[PDB]
Each structure stands twice: as C-alpha cells, then as structure tokens.
Amino acid sequence: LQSVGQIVGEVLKQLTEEKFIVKATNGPRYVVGCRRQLDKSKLKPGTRV
Amino acid sequence: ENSEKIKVNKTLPYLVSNVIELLDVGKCAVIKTSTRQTYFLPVIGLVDAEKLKP
Amino acid sequence: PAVDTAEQVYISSLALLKMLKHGRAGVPMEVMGLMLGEFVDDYTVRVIDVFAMPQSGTGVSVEAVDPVFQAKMLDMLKQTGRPEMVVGWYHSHPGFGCWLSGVDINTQQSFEALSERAVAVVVDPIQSVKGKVVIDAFRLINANMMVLGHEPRQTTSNLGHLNKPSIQALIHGLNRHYYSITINYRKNELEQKMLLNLHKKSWMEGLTLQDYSEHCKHNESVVKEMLELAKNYNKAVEEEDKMTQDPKRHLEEHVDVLMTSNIVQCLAAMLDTVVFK
Amino acid sequence: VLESTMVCVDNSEYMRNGDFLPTRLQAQQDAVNIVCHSKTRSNPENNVGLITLANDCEVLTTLTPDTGRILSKLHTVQPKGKITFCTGIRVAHLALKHRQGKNHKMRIIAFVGSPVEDNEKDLVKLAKRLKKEKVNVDIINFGEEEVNTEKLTAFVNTLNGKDGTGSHLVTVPPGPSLADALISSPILAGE
Amino acid sequence: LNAKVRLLREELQLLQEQGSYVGEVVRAMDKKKVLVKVHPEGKFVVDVDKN
Amino acid sequence: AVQKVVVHPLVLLSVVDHFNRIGKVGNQKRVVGVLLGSWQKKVLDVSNSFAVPFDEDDKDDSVWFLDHDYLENMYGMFKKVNARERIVGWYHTGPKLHKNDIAINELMKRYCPNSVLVIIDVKPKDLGLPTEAYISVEEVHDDGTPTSKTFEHVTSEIGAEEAEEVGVEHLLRDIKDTTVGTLSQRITNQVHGLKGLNSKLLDIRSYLEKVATGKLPINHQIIYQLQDVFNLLPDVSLQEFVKAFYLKTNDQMVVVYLASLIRSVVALHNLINNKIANRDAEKKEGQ
Amino acid sequence: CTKIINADSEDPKYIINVKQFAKFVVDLSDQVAPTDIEEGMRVGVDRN
Amino acid sequence: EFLHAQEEVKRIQSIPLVIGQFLEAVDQNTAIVGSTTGSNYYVRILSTIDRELLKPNASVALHKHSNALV
Amino acid sequence: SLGLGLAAMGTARQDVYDLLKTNLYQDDAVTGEAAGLALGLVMLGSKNAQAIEDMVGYAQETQHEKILRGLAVGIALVMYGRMEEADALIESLCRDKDPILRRSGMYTVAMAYCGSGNNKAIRRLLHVAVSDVNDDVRRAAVESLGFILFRTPEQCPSVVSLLSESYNPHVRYGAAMALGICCAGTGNKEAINLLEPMTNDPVNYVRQGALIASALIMIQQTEITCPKVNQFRQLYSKVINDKHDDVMAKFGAILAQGILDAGGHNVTISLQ
Amino acid sequence: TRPANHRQLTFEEIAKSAKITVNEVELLVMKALSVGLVKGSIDEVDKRVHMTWVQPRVLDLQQIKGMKDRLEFWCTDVKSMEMLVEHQAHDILT
C-alpha cells in the first residue's frame, strides 16, 4: 500500500555519466539522473526504464 | 485490525486500468492507466496475483 | 483579545527534519501528522517534535487522524519522557503550493475547537529543493471578525512582518480565511555540530593528494584555455584602445583556479614528505 | 486492591527434578497459571509480569492486565542454566518502578525452587533495601528446602519488619501437587 | 563586491519566479480586457495589468 | 555480516533530543533506543530510531529493564507509518560500553539476527563522527585463546536522504562553508588533516604504551595492522623519487609563475584604466 | 455509467466513463434514488 | 557570500530539468520556449548560456517548476 | 512596571527594585518585558552586582523571548556610564549564545561607552555588525555605534556611509537609525545626503528607519538652515498619501513628521 | 627488522644470515615471493633485493616497545610540522 509506482520511459541520448535524456511514454522528455546501484551501460538509446 | 486497515485504504475511487504487461524479478506490473498513461508497479498490490494475464 | 502579528511557531530541528522526511516519504499521497509541542505564553508555539499519521487513503482530513493510534503513541511517548500536548497538525501539499484547501480549513477549525491556538503547517516537498524550505504555518480567521472591519490579527510590533506572502496563497485566499504565522527555528549548538558531521570532511581527505596524472592534464588544459583567453584579451585591449570584460574576467577566473590548485597540491606534497617521515 | 505483581520463575536445570508429577516444569507452569489467574480475577485492573531466572535474568512479560500472553510465553520455558536470584529480584524491582500504573501495590512472587547460592550479607542488604522501597516479596519454596529455608526466612522476616504481612514464605517439601499447595496458601487466600 | 552579490541575488529571484504562458490576442474586447487564446487549451478573456 | 553502516541526520538529531529530554526530566548516564533501517547488500541504512524506556543499576552492572513490550509496540506503529524500515539494531548514548551491552544485544538479536549497536555520542567531538558501530560476534578464536561473546567494530558513515539534506542545509545555512575550495579553506583543511593525523598517532602511541607496560593484552589484529602500516611507510630520501618530486614541483611552480604574471599584468591594466579615468575626471572638473 | 459491476447486490461500486478524461470506479452520494441509475444514464460526477 | 550565490546558481542549473525547444529570443535574458509538455511559455534565461549558440528552435533544458531556460 | 521604572529612573530604590523583581519572577511576556525594562531603568548606572546577576540569571533561565528583550534593554541600561567597568559583562554577553543576550551585549557596549568615541567599543560593534549571524544583533550593533559616536556628528557619516550601502537590510536599517541617533538635533548635511537614497529603497523597514532618522536629524531645522527640510516634508506627505506605500513605510513617515514638529517647534533632541 | 629507509637487502647480508652461499639466495627469495611471505623484486645485477612488504606475525613486548619508540618519533615530527604550518598560515586560516 506504500509502494508508489514508477513511470515507464525510454532512453534517447546518453548524456554525461550522470545525465540521461528519457522520453516518458505518452509524456514529455526529461533529463534525469540514474540510481547509483542501478549501474550503467545497460541504458542505451531505446532502453526501457 | 489489519483487514479493516486494508479496507479503509482501498477507498472506492479507483482508476480503471489495464495490466498490459506482467513481469517477474516477486511479480510486477506495467499497468496502462485509462488516463492514456503507463505506470510500472514494482509491487502489484492488494490483488491476489491470480496470474493477472497481460 | 486578538492574536497579534508577532506570534511565532518555533519548529525544532528534529520536527523540521521529520516533516520533510515524511513528506518526501509518501509523496504524492497527502501525508499528515500531529505536532507534539507547547504554547508558552501568547506569542510562542514551540513544536518540539512531530508525530506521523498512518496513510489512511481517504486523503487528509479528520477521518485520517485515527484517534486510537494518536492516544496509544502519545501515551507511550509520555512513557518515553516526552510529555507534550498536540499543538496543531502538519500535512504536505506535494508540489501544488503551500496553503489551505477547504478540507484543510475544516480540519484546522476542528483543531482550533480543541484548543484555539493550534497552528496548521504545510510543507511542499516537491518544491522544497535543497537550499530552500517551502514551509508555512497558518491559522483561520473567524468569519465574524473580518466582516466586522477589524483586522484578523493585531499589530503591536514590527516583528511578524518582513515576510512576503506567496502569490499562490493570495490567489487561494491567504488573508481572507486564514493568516500566515511566522516560522522560527530553534537551533542548538550541539544540534548544529551534529548536522555539520553530515558533510564534515575527514582528515584523510584533508591531507590527501590529487592524482598526479589528472593534475597534469588539468593544468595543461587550463593553461591552453588561458592561452586562448590571452589572445582574445590582447585583441580586445588593442581594439578598444584604438577605437578610444569577458576576456579579462575569464582569464582572471582561470588564473585563480590554476594558482589555488597548484599551490594546494604543492603544499600537500610538502606536508606529506615531512610528516610521513 | 490495585496490584502490580511480578512472577519470578526458576528455569534452572534442577527443574529437571521430577518430584512434582509429571515434572517440576509442568508443576511450576500450573502454579504460575493458577496464581496469575487468581491475581487477575480479583480486581482485573491488577497487572502481572513474568521473569525468567536463568544463567542471566530475563523479563518475558512486563506488567500487563492480560494473562494468556504470560501463559503462552512461559509455556516455552525450558530447564537450562543456573539461578541468579539476586539479579532476578533486582530486575523485578526495576520493572515495578517502571510499571505504567503508579497506583498499585508492589508484589513479587518468586518460584525459587533451587539452592540459592548468594552471599548472606548482600542478601540481607537486598531484603532491607526492598523493604525500604516498600516491596512485598512472596517466596514459593519447592526444592532444596534444607539449604534455602533459613535464607528465605531471612527474606520474609526482614521484609515484614514488624506486623509486615506483605511478604510471605510458603515452603512445600511434600509434592502432592504444587498447584493445590499454592491455591491453599496464605498468599492467594487474601485475594 | 556588493553590486556583484546583489546582481546574482536578483537574478536568482527573477529566475526562480514562475514562468508565463503565451497566447494570441483574438480581439482587445472592452477596455482592460483582452480575449486571448492560449495554446493548446481554450481561450480566456484576461484582465490586462496596469503597465 | 555487515560491512558498512550509514546513519542519518534524522537519527542523530532524534538521539540527541532523546538524551536531552531524558537528562532534563532526570539524570542518567545513558539513554537507549532502537535503530530502524534497511539493508542493501552488507550496507545497513539506519534511517530512523525511537527511544525505549530503560534504566539499570549502575552499581550491579548486570541489572537493567529494557522494555521489550514497548519496543514491539513502537516498532509496530512505525511499521504502520512506514513499512520499508524494519528493526536493524539499537543505540545507546554512552561514551563507553558496559557489561550490559552484550546482554542487551542478545535481547535485540531476537528482533534482528544481525543486530548492530550504534553508540551515538551526544558530546560533540571535532575529529571523528559521533557514531561508533559494533556487531556482536562470538567465534572460536583461531588465536587459541579463551573465547567470550564480545563486540567487533563496524565501519560507520553519515549519509542523508535528499529530503534530509534539504533540512540539514537549511538549518546550517548561517554557519555553512563554501562548497568550493578557496585557497584559505584548502590550507585550513590541510592543517586539520595534520591535526587529525597527530591525534590518531597519539592514540596509537598511548595504546602501545599501555600494552607494553602490561595494563592491556596484546591484540593480534591491532599489532598486525600496525606492522602493515610501518611496512607501508614510504621512502622519501630515494634519489629516483627526489628527482621526480623536484620535476613535478618545478612544473607546478612554472604554472603558478605564469598565473601570477598574468594576474600582475591584469592588475597593471586595471590601474592604467583607473589613472586614465582619474585624469579624465579631474580635467572635466577643472573645465 | 458503462458497467454497474453487477451491483454485487449490496455495495454497488458503479463504473463511470468520463469522456476525454478517464474511467473510474465510484459510488453514489446523497443519491435519493439509488435505483434510478441504470447503465449509460449520463450521471453527474464530482471533481475530487 | 559571492561564492554562496554562485553555488546557488550552479544548483538551480540542476539535474531533473525538462527538455524543450527554445523558439526565439524576445529580449536579453528572456525568451520564449515550447516545452515537450506541449505548452509554450515566456521564460527567463539564466546568465551565460552562450546566447551565440542559443539560436531559434534549439534543444534546451528547462527548470521543472519555473520553466526557466537553464 | 513601565510607569514605576520611568518614575524611579536612576533612584535605585531597593523597595522598587525588589517589587519589580517579584513582578518579573513569573512566566508572562507582557508583564516580564515591562518588569525587566523598569528594572534596568531603576538600576541605571548603579552597576549593582546583585542586579546584573539576577537579571542575567533570569534571562538565561526564562523561556519567553519578549521577557528576554526586556531584560536585554534592562541590562544595557544598568551598565550605563561605566566606561571600563562594563567590559566583563560585555564580553560575557557577547560570547553568550542567546541572540537576544548578544543584542543585550551590543546595547551594554553602547550604554557603557556612551558618547565617548571609544575606539575599542567601535571596533567591537563594527566586528559584530558583519561577523554575527543574527540580523537583530547586527542592527543593534550599528545602533550602538551611533550611540557611541553621537558626540562628534561629523565623524559618524564616515562610518555609516559604507554600512548604509550594505546588502543586509537589517544592517542598512541599523545604519539609518545610528545616523539618526548620532546627528539627532544637529541637522548635518552628509547625514541627510546618506539618508535620502536610503529613503528611496526597495526594502520595507529600511525606508521607515531612514525617515525616522531624518526626522531625528532635522528636528527644529528651517529651510534656509538646511535646504532639504521642505523636500523631506514633501516626501513624508507623498508617502503618507500613497496607494502602494508599505504599512511600515507609512508608519515611519508619520512618526518622522511627529518628531520633526515635536513639541510644537519648541523642543530639540540632544543627548548632551 | 629493516626499516623502509634501507630495506635494500643484499646477497651478502642474506649469506651472513641463514647459511647459504650467494648462488641460491636468488632461489630462496623466489620461493619467499611465490609463497607470499614478502613482496618486491630482486636486482641480481647489483646483487640486492628490494622488499616492499612482509607478512605480519605476532610479536613480543620488546618488539612492541620498539614500535612505541618509532611512533614517538613519528608523533614528534607530525607535531612539529603541524606547528610550523599553523604558525606560518595563521593569518589565512579560516
């Protein structure tokens, strides 16, 4: 009951290590940070997050 | 007491939505809210996980 | 009697931190809680601590107080050694401003009926970006007083003013139904030192050396940039003095960074060579 | 009579002694159940907690008005280690002081069947101290009577002082039934 | 130094102030009122400021 | 086991407030509470805490009354408020341990298998963090010595949620330092580093004094680590190192020289402009 | 109201189809005639 | 205090910004943008965002709340 | 309590002091503020060790910021006219962690080194005007600076020209009020030159302070004596007759008129 | 025993130590490094061995008194350098 859902989006541009352009499905495009433990190189243009 | 609290927290005005995609990691969801929106749920919630077919 | 524009709500460090934690730990759902505090004489509302309320689903209202939980945990806090009354309530408004809506007004009216000093505080975690705490206290204006032409709150001193009311609160009726109380923070020296411990640097990082290859690369990069700015500044001085700024300013910034970095590392190396043998 | 009681229970190895049918463990379980129920029936506002006397003392249940939880938490008590009576009693006094309801008399009934290996001087000092803080330490002796009877008499005499019926000693060398011995005892008679 | 600090602070204030919509004036109906259509939502009649 | 524990500003403030209120109502050397947090690998995140009623006989040193019922009730209500915070340990605001710490950790291990003590010193120091973390490990000493159930130190750190960082920064806005290296502050940081190194070396020397005289026994892990430290001390008189050191110092000094030359030329330009402006102003005033 | 969810006898739990906005599962409120609801009857619904 | 103000500006040039298309420059330190949300705003430009590079119809990040081009 | 303190100002009557002590020994802001201020007025100059001890102890032990303010002004008045005998108390109050008590320390500096131009006190106040964190204490420090320098009116504008151009509005207001106290009933020219731009500020209370200081300075001044008095009279009239002018700016203008025409053009303000 | 200043052990030194002629000190050091007892290298052209590590072991009270003396010296040096830096930069310390 205390688990707020996320919003699915797609990576687009692969900015600097800590910056990713992500387009939210049926929504706008943001520049977002990545969770530390999530680890990187698994988020390439088109990847679902 | 626990069931009463769950009943109070399941206040009626739900948002009718789909279960477009179902994943595992426990189970998850990629529900499609009828507000033309898509929401990933890491925890399905109160539902019984009755196979919740896509 | 008339409450004057001098009353202050003193939100303790622990109270404020708990408020912000609860807000950002339950966004977007409207989180709520009680204020274990104390009215001292007439101008003080000391919110010693806060008291989270379980998410009741039915938004924020009197229905979400869950009085049994209130009484049980208040009794047990008293057992712990925290005997404070409930001076009002707090509830978040995640991103849509810091004011009161109709349900908020009804709840605060109920709290005033319990005791006509309770303050309703609102925290907006979404716009509470680090460096700016958008929190605001409120109390309702009796419907009779405003129509009677008398001001909602007395004004006996210059304290209480110096606060610019928010446009959002105005358009939602800041002074027509309630009024914003001034929020003060009671910061103890021990608490401040504990807070400093958060980002306090370690003596290691104080005495450590930057990677030497990276240092050389940075020096070379900045010196090349400063070369380019030197050419630009030469052309700028020549042209301005022949026909009679950004180049000079950027060059000053680059020289400053170069000097500070190089001197710091040189001294750190000297200290290491001496101290570690 | 608004009462706050602490039932100290020995779970030392000597509870493996089987003089009381079927075992000393089951006998003490029945006795504690009976005494707790007797305390609760009279003025249910009374509250009862429970202490385990093992290699190191423990408090299984603080002062509560319920008895089923105390029974349930005692049922899983097994015989182990050795008794530390002084520490058990001090923990009981601390629990009494921390009891939520300050409008209760202070009682501690101790199933202490064991040879109490403690020094007589500090023993009498503890008894007098408890008398000073106005405690009533009732003591149920079933076991090494020949060893601990004089010390238990010291307990109760020092606690009573003069006309101090608060603290009592009940010794049961015979083993017909611990529960029946307790129910037909002065401690429960006044309730 | 005072001028520099004041400039930065004023920039901070004016930049953290909320943005503003852009609309197309259908017709300056009435004084102090302007029928304006704001993209993409409907069209309002705004009360123009005194500046 | 747990390799790291990160305590939070909210936990620190709550502990300080608990100690203050208890010492205001009465007098006690320690105050005790439960630490609530979550695990992410072997990195405990102590994100909350709550006090529990607790008193002991400071003379007996083995009689105490930690309230398990109060503990479980508060834990249940904190579960109701927030769910991703399970009991992960306990804390006591005592500068030093006591014989009761092992017993209370045994008590807490019933609520958490990996129960961790966190001593949060309300008295504010100046070199290290206010939190010391301990995990109770009892294992047959490969040393071959008698084994007793005792604590073992756990690496501790202070971290903050973003919603706690905002509050911390706001509370410290008046006495905050710049989040940038200004030359004066960097030199000050180096001086503080020397201070910390000296204090740590003094502590090690005092421990060596005590163990050598005989007051304390030889701790083999301590001696191993000290041996490794002395092995790790560099050699700065080596010619091959002195030459590289002088080379790097000369490179840094030439960069500094170029910087200072540029700065002096800029200052001269500024003064030329000022002299010209003064000339213009005085000529205009005269005419 | 595109589906009365069978009315589950008691606890109706009506469904609504606010056009261009969303679908919802809602109930009545001070509806003095909880029977005159039908399906597709174009009911009025609050905002919050 | 000057260092603090600089740090505050560097901060408001934050991470969670919103993408949008800078449409044109109205005046100095102010311009019109169209955010990917689908709405057009008259926002304020921060200082030193290379107005030379800031050409019409350019991808730019916007402050999530004030929509300022940062 | 206020009336009795005013009536017994400087008398140091033991009975009045003890009655005021009893009235102060409660938990109530309205009574405690007056009780403390009247204690200060009664003990003024006496340097009574008992008075200082009792007032500081109650200030430290109380919980009402209003009582704290009253006791702050009271201690300041108590340690009046004592040039160097006030330094121990000044150091104690300045090092105290209660911001109201630090303000009390600023006021103690002012009262002790009143009208002496003591450079040590000026240095202390100027240091606290920029090092301290509490804007209240900064403003009190600037006011104390004016109180110290009132004897040499030409001297103060040199100090306060820079303070008036401060990014801290509280320090700006303190600068204005310090100029007012220093050049009260003097009608200096550079002081008015500094006040006028401050009279035109975007901050609310800086304008009030500037207006009141200008009234203090130009009290009993004619157009010929100061060719700006008519200008400030027009300014006061304009600010009073305005739509958006802030409440406190209007308050300051109204006061300014009152002081400027104080006593029916028959009384001036001079501290000596 | 050898301090980090002159940890350059020599073939002749190892010969005067555990009895072996200098034609297999090389093999002995190879065995030590391979087992992991020590770390470093062997410059047999100059006939010396560079040690940059040792496997720590358990020590005696006198072996710890020596460490205490070495610390004493290190603490003295650190304190002297601290005082020098603090006094020199006194006017710019924040």
Ligand SMILES: [Zn+2]
């Ligand atoms: Zn609300």
